[PDB]
Write a protein that binds this DNA or RNA. Structure first.
Lengths: 97, 83, 76, 109, 227, 95, 97, 83, 109, 95, 227
DNA sequence: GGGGTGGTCGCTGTTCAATACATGCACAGGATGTATATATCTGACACGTGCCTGGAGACTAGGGAGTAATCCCCTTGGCGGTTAAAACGCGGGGGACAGCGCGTACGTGCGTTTAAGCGGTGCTAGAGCTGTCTACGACCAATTGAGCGGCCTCGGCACCGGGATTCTCCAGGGCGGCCGCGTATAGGGTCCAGCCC
DNA sequence: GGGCTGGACCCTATACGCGGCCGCCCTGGAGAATCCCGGTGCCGAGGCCGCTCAATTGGTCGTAGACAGCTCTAGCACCGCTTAAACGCACGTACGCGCTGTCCCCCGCGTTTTAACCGCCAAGGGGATTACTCCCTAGTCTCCAGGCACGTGTCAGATATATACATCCTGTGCATGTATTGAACAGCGACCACCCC
């Protein structure tokens, strides 16, 4: 019979995996394309340095990780374990955004 | 030439990975679109300032120094790319 | 064909009264003083008894379902 | 004849450049005048802070059995310290990762 | 590979007013992370010098230290009556913090509240409380130190209330266990399987996470006795 | 050749060779340490300049730097930085 | 039997009253004594300007109001209406304090 | 002379009024001590900086300008007191 | 003959003191040099922002049937605007109070 | 004897008499408006100084101040402040 | 008491390339808070001039506004065939915003998605949605404008999505009531007790909370017809 | 030697112990993941070399800051009343919270698709650097008028008294669903007449 | 010739609707709060006058940046190949949300206490100003060595492989409860041994 980990076990293994690692979690080429798609609104035909796209990726990933930490805290405050858009909205509202 | 719908490039598993690093055990299905919206807002705020710095320098290339300056201006000081 | 906790709950309902039925919580509180009552899973046996006696229709559910709500004896 | 030049870093017993710090203060548009001891004090403070962070990061690397300090070790050193974390609360470390932490309620029964 | 710390003069006599020097030799290079303590009998040690030369807060300039690398020294210039006590060096350049043997010198607001004496039968367990007050609890590690008249002072381990981090002396792993309570600002020390060897005074001591910072304030010392 | 861009790398590496004789440092951590030094310099210098402007003083002295250090750096990090600065200034004055 | 408002009616009237008013909510003399006691730890024999104490009271009251707003949002997030120390701790820890 | 217990001068009704202005309908009984602790922390943080500025100016009187500068240094910019 | 003085404020058409702004820019240790148009441009920006806030506060005062602008009116004007509230989000206004705002779930029925 | 203490009170009042000729203003509102003017001045001046330092420029120009305004003022505040400043600078240049 | 706007020239005829000047008179001083709009038939109005002198985004310099106080003017220098349209002044200095009677001229990415035409019977209600995209929804007020072919343009009222604040024309209290949905970036206008008088095209119009800002982007317009 | 009754056997109703069902806890073992040890290698890092520019040495100018002295103002300390607010107490209701039930939304795994990553090539826009020259900002001296301090008055608003409107809470009455008691019904017990043994 | 059976009259157990009762909902009225309106007075804003200092004007000069031109870097575009990850889908389970019930603990109002606030007065410390001076830093010129660009080699970590341990998941067995059924046992109908007349 096929082996199956019960729900949440692979989730905890994955949390431990990614909290130990340091590499970028967002696909690099898609994030670059997203940056260019946004930037074309402000100024056309913008060139981007490789290190500039990388710095944007580092900053966005750190911001999202911090936001999810606060979202998890809000969800646990609501005695839940599932983070929800209302949790994210609460975190953003409290941070002052 | 143009780019139109690249916010879908922040895939559901990528958002899951970001949540996992953030310590999230279980994720609602609407987190993906909520986080895509939040990320797009943050990127717009950062890139507007970085492009403003680039325009001021009369450069056509957006540089990591401009990105670092925009981040510092937004209270999100980034170490590793300055200089 | 009774049982220890079955008879326990069926007499605790009489002893407690509660025209609008006795809930599982207050039956548990009033039964916990019983000498033989098991602390670890006595509540589990009380829930078993409640469900079985509702199956036997000797207990009446005033509102709710399962072990929720309040229970009163079906008259005869 | 001019005497043999002695760097102000050597005079103050510091490794950071006192002359460079003084020149950055004077060219940085901070005041009309810059006191002679101000670059020495500022270089001393910067050297102390750098030594503190580098030593904590070297300790973290040693526990991680790494002989070279990496941004992961810098992040660990900064975040495992309350005073350094409060100094650098708004700061992001590239390739630094995050502290391993799982909320107690998420752990299995 | 422990850094054995050798205070050369174990005991000395001195009159009032003359200079006294106390010498410490470290087994390995501790890179100037050495501190000196003054312990009057039956009272907690007070810090005097840290980073091998710097006077602790409130200590008169009479006390002075020198040395670096492996050789260290303590100097007292104007001996007054209250200078009679036992002086202990403490290296904290490497993970096991080591006290010196202790030079007995005799001549012719931050508060750490620690519980009273304990009488315990062997094999039982005890939980010494540390109540910290007058400062920001999370910013400073709480260091636990065991003092016996036969082995002197011994560092057991520390708790960092900021992240509940711990480090223990290898002699005490399993034996000692530390926990903290952010709400009550209290730190507790569990001792498992008490033995006759555990008849000792245990001191809680505050130490900032700064590497050059030393044990600055001490608890009164819970005298634990094993029957 | 490329223009000579100043950096703190050699000074940070000298500090590293003192605090950990055998440990090295990667180039990315080197850049992070350069950014850290630049950032802390900017903070302390800005605070000292604001102090001088508040007191209507034209000059920045070791006293302004000391006050900026006490204001910015927390806890005993501030007091250790102050002790280090005082030691360095005294040594420099003694020449 | 006398008239009596049901719980929460007078609380809502106070909420509206104190959101209309701008006067200080903490008594000036004991807040002044608190400020002087706290400052006594940093330098003995300090004088305070009247305007310095007023500015401190303004800042403290506004900070407490801003913190209670986030505390109330967290309580509402938990489906509650009573604000609790866990709510204050959540708001503070999300704000980064 | 020596002040010893003035944190209790932030009375329960005063904390209740601050909560009412903050929009709080119902208040747990431990909120009072928690808020007193938070207020003590904030006051210590601000007054330490104010006293530092006063010491730098060699003055003995803590001024509203010193308080405003401390608040601004903490990101609590206060308008109305000479800033 | 020497021409009668004509203030740079009047030349620019501004109310705010372009000359004072230029003095502050020179004395503030912001740069080695200050272009002639910089204080004009900055005085115009300050005049615009001041006029906007004062006009919103005057509207609020008129709605409250008060003749004189008060800190309550300033606070109402600033907080009732998304852009001004983003500009001055970190700012506390003395005696400004707070906006009337009760969460829907607290209201009865 | 007393000394001059400059403030923006008169200019705030003269702008008030344009935006609302009949509306007055209390002294505390004058103080708050003075603090607002000073705060925004220091923000724009500091941002312009940082821009000049980033570009290695030694002078602060109307282009520096314009970029600082666009960075600091959000939304349409930036657009209208830019338009007002540009109009003022153009009039000043013409006269 | 509502400020009457008096566009003196009701209609003009002109050839290509020659200058055309349209003027407006106010009944009270509005302190330059006046805008000019171009409306080609069956199209939504586009703004040309705002703050009585400033050009709108992307409009060519051919359009030049002038004046202040009560007398205002609009100038078109180089006419083109495309310029055949109706021009309305709009004061927004005082609470009831007022459009001019309109001047007809004959020559010989922010999106507001607004619903299509809605047939309705008298006495019932109709709810018209506004779907705002391409910008920060909460930062701008949504202005609703009613256009009859007999009474010209009328400003109904607005909603500020930032704080859900609303302000209504006294002619439309009760008749109109505005609601907002941040989660869908949608603004709803409902008309109660529809009457044959209410047969008109309704335009949503974005306008920044800035006082000098004008109604810059317009929805395509929802035609409501009452039987 | 027949009529008749209790004893005892067979058939059956009652209950009672074994059967069966369902749920909860401990453990062996199997599948999987993770750290640990060993060997290869590669490219990043530590160190050496040239040189060049920016920091050190030596000296002067001058002005900013330190120090002494004086004023006066504004902070502290005290005292006497006066309520307004705080402290405390009690009744109660309503909200926190624990527990259970249910359904569905999210977690895990497998097979398929896709497009990211990597390498390699080619090109050109533009970042960076140098050289020229002019406009512009600093600086100085004389001038003077704008803006600050002091004086004053007078009107906007804060407060007080009084109705008037609004909003809250609840007590009493209208209305409907749940429960007690009486009724048409038929099942069965019993009385009258014909019939079979 | 008389009891059995059939049919009919009467005693009685029963399913069901109407009246009584408990709860839900509606509405008018008491009363408490807040708002609109008028009257009073007071102190703070707005205006006027004197003055003083800094903002303006006119002119000089030096240097920073605007502009032009060149170079050579890296950013962009494209193509091919591999494979890792993303996606679609199935399945199931555990978690979120709703309902009920308990009870505790916070709200509302009344009563007593106390200390905050305000008015008035006095001392006196220290912040601000002014004059004098001196020494500390800016500025200049010379020059030389430290630090940056570049080159080079080697070893520390990245990667691949194998292994040994740890963790999790689950099927099995055991212990607890529950409801369930064939049979062990006793009561009564009926056959037979035996008493009485």
């Amino acid at each position: 019979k096929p082996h199956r980990y019960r729900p949440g076990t692979v989730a905890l293994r994955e949390i431990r995996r990614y909290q130990k690692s340091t590499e970028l979690l967002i696909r690099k080429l898609p994030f670059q394309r997203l940056v260019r798609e946004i930037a074309q609104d402000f100024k056309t035909d913008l060139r981007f340095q490789s290190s500039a796209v990388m710095a944007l990726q580092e900053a966005c990933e750190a911001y999202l990780v911090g936001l999810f930490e606060d979202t998890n805290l809000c969800a646990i405050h609501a005695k839940r374990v599932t983070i929800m858009p209302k949790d994210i909205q609460l975190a953003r509202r409290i941070r002052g955004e | 030439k143009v780019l139109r719908d690249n916010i879908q490039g922040i895939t559901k598993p990528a958002i899951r990975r970001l949540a996992r690093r953030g310590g999230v055990k279980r994720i609602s299905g609407l987190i993906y679109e909520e986080t895509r919206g939040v990320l797009k807002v943050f990127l717009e705020n950062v890139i507007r300032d970085a492009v403003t710095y680039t325009e001021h320098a009369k450069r056509k290339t957006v540089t990591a120094m401009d990105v670092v300056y925009a981040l510092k201006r937004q209270g999100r000081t980034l170490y590793g790319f300055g200089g | 064909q009774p049982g220890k906790y079955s008879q326990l709950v069926v007499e605790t309902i009489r002893r407690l009264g509660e025209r609008n039925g006795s809930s599982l919580a207050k039956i548990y509180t009033e039964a916990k003083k019983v000498p033989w009552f098991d602390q670890q899973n006595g509540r589990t046996y009380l829930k078993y008894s409640i469900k079985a006696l509702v199956q036997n229709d000797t207990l009446l559910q005033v509102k709710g379902t399962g072990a929720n709500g309040s229970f009163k004896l079906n008259r005869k | 004849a001019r005497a043999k030049a002695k760097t102000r870093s050597s005079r103050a017993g510091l490794q950071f450049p006192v002359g460079r710090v003084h020149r950055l203060l004077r060219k940085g548009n901070y005041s009309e005048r810059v006191g002679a001891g101000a670059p020495v004090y500022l270089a001393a403070v910067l050297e102390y802070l750098t030594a503190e962070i580098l030593e904590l990061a070297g300790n973290a690397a040693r526990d991680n059995k790494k002989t070279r300090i990496i941004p992961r070790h810098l992040q660990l050193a900064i975040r495992n310290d309350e005073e350094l974390n409060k100094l650098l609360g708004r700061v992001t470390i590239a390739q630094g990762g995050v502290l391993p932490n799982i909320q107690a309620v998420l752990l299995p029964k | 590979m422990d850094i054995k710390m050798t205070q050369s003069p174990s005991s000395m006599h001195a009159s009032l007013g003359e200079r006294v020097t106390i010498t410490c030799k470290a087994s390995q290079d501790i890179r100037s992370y050495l501190s000196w303590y003054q312990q009057k009998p039956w009272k907690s040690p007070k810090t005097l010098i840290y980073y091998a030369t710097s006077l602790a807060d409130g200590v008169p300039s009479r006390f002075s230290g020198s040395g670096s690398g492996q050789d260290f020294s303590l100097t007292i210039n104007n001996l007054e009556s209250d200078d009679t006590a036992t002086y202990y060096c403490l290296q904290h350049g490497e993970s096991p913090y080591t006290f010196g043997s202790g030079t007995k010198l005799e001549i012719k607001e931050v508060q750490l509240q620690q519980s009273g004496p304990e009488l315990v039968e062997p094999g039982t367990s005890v939980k010494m409380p540390c109540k910290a007050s007058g400062y920001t609890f999370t910013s400073y590690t709480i260091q636990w130190v065991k003092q016996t008249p036969r082995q002197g002072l011994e560092w057991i381990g520390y708790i960092y209330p900021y992240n509940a981090g711990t480090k223990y002396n290898e002699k005490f792993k399993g034996k000692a266990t530390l926990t903290s309570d952010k709400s009550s600002s209290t730190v507790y020390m569990e001792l498992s399987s008490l033995t006759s060897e555990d008849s000792a005074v245990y001191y809680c001591a505050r130490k900032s996470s700064r590497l050059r910072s030393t044990l600055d304030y001490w608890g009164q010392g819970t005298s634990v006795t094993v029957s | 050749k490329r223009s000579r861009k100043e950096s703190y790398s050699i000074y940070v590496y000298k500090v590293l060779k003192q605090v950990h004789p055998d440990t090295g440092i990667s180039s990315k951590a080197m850049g992070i340490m350069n950014s850290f030094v630049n950032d802390i310099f900017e903070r302390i210098a800005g605070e000292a300049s604001r102090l001088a402007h508040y007191n209507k003083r034209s000059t920045i002295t070791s006293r302004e730097i000391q006050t900026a250090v006490r204001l910015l750096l927390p806890g005993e990090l501030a007091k250790h930085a102050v002790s280090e600065g005082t030691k360095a200034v005294t040594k420099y004055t003694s020449a």
